[PDB]
Amino acid sequence: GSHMRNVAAEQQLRELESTFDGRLGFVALDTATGARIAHRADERFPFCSTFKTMLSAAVLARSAGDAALLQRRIPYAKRDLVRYSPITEKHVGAGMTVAELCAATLQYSDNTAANLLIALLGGPQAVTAYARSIGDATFRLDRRETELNTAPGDERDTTTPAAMAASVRRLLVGDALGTAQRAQLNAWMLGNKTGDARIRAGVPAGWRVADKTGTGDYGTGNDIGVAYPPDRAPIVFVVYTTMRSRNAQARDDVIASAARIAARAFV
């Protein structure tokens, strides 16, 4: 890639933002060189379900020091379910293992799974403390599902594109987790089912993508992750978007277009 391509990409992100009534927060990192393409990198955005990556990392970190944490089965009843639990609703009673809950929350964005894992760790303060432990002093999880998602300069349940990009890089590509835990987190996110129209839609079909989406009111549309091209270094993608109108729908097309801008600039 080149400096001039990265500068041009940043201009294209400004132009993309001008096409809708909202804000675009974006960071892409080419791990070959540390080159960054950024837009509103240090502004806060509501993270919505993208926090589930940090949550699952925190669980994996706990598992490194515990016997068989990932195999613990956590029982719950139908009356413990919160809104949007497509996987956990199928296993009420005996429940699901911690590993299965991580998979459910990452791949389907399952909210009961998230809340079960938040409780396991000791609450939202524990997830935030985990973030601090990996060098992220920007991320703040204040609430649980589904309150954190009702999304405005309310700094609760926000992070910045830059903070989240550094965290995603350290977790999925770097050494924030042990070698084996990194492989597991990647494996789960590479199987995400909710992101086909977002980062995945903006990069070549021949790239592997590990991603986690977030969606909320004010047309909040997010996607974070790493793309793995076949014969080059991984590229980190962090996309946050939110709109001025509370009624607005999220914009998959915008998210895909932002990822495409960086993909073309780095390839």
Residue numbers in the entry: 22 to 172, 184 to 248, 250 to 262, 264 to 301
What does the paper say about this structure?
In class A β-lactamases, a conserved structural element called the omega loop5 constitutes a wall at the active site that shapes the binding cavity. PenL (NCBI reference sequence: YP_439646.1) is highly conserved in pathogenic Burkholderia species, including Burkholderia pseudomallei, Burkholderia mallei, and Burkholderia cenocepacia. PenL has been used as a model in exploring various evolutionary paths to substrate spectrum extension through amino acid substitutions, deletions, and duplications. In this study, we demonstrate the extensive perturbation-absorbing capacity of the omega loop against TR mutations of various sizes, some of which are large enough to include the entire omega loop.
In contrast to the PenL-WT structure, in which every residue could be mapped, PenL-tTR10 and PenL-tTR11 both had a highly disordered region, where the mapping of the residues was not feasible due to high mobility. In PenL-tTR10, two additional residues flanking the first unit on either side were not mapped. In both PenL-tTR10 and PenL-tTR11, it appeared that the α10 helix structure (13 residues: 183–195) downstream of (in the case of PenL-tTR10) or overlapping (in the case of PenL-tTR11) the tTR required the second repeat unit of the tTR, instead of the first unit, to be in place in the protein backbone. In the PenL-tTR structures, perturbations in the omega loop resulted in the dislocation of a number of nearby residues, along with the disorganization of the α-helix in the omega loop (Glu166-Asn170), which most notably led to the breakage of a salt bridge that is normally present between Thr167 and Arg104 and tightly packs the active-site cavity. In PenL-tTR10, the side chain of Asn170 exhibited a particularly large movement of 9.63 Å, causing it to swing 180° from the active site cavity. Furthermore, the side chain of Asp240 was rotated approximately 90°, moving away from the active site by 3.21 Å in PenL-tTR10 and by 2.89 Å in PenL-tTR11. The side chain of Tyr105, which is known to be involved in substrate recognition and the stabilization of the enzyme-substrate complex, was flipped and moved away from the active site by 1.17 Å in tTR10 and by 1.00 Å in tTR11. The volume of the active site in PenL-tTR10 was 274.9 Å3, as measured with CASTp29. This is much larger than that of PenL-WT, which was 182.3 Å3, demonstrating the extreme expansion of the active sites in the mutant enzyme. In PenL-tTR10, the interaction between W1 and the general base Glu166 remained, although the geometry was altered.
